[PDB]
Structures are given as structure tokens and as C-alpha cells.
Amino acid sequence: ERSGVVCRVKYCNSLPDIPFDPKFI
Amino acid sequence: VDVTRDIVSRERVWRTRTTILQSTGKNFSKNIFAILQSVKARE
């Protein structure tokens, strides 16, 4: 309407964690 | 102990942390650094 919907707009950035692939003998 | 070196030698790591961040294609950063300098040309 008079103004848009409110948001805490952030261009965030995530991180992958440690994979732990099953090991290869 | 002997078990530690005994296992970490014989296994293999094909999947680490760092090359997850690195992309499997070849995306260089000159294009990235060129537009980095280009926005500095607006500055």
C-alpha cells in the first residue's frame, strides 16, 4: 500500500560443512 | 599410536573441504576482478 512489506533484507552467504567422504583404502 | 598412522596411510581422501569451495568448472576471476575495477571506475 503506502509502503511495502517490511524485511531484514540481507544478502547472506552459507557455508558447506566438512564432507567426510567414506574412505578409500 | 600405530593404529593412527596405520589407518591414515592406507585410506585416501578424494573429497576435502577446500575444493568444495573451488568450482569443478573453470571460472577465473579476471572477469570478476575486471568488474571489480569497473565499479572502482564508478568510484
Query: 10 Å Cβ neighbour count for B20?
Result: 14
Q: Is B15's CB within 8 Å of A21's CB?
A: yes
**Using CA atoms, how far apart are residues B21 and B29, in angstroms rounded to an integer?**
14
Q: Is B13's CB within 8 Å of A18's CB?
A: no
Q: Is A23's CB within 8 Å of B13's CB?
A: yes
**Using CA atoms, how far apart are residues B22 and B16, in angstroms rounded to an integer?**
11
**Using CA atoms, how far apart are residues B41 and B18, in angstroms rounded to an integer?**
33
Place of cell 575486471: B34
List of residues 6+ apart from B10 with CB closer than 8 A: A25
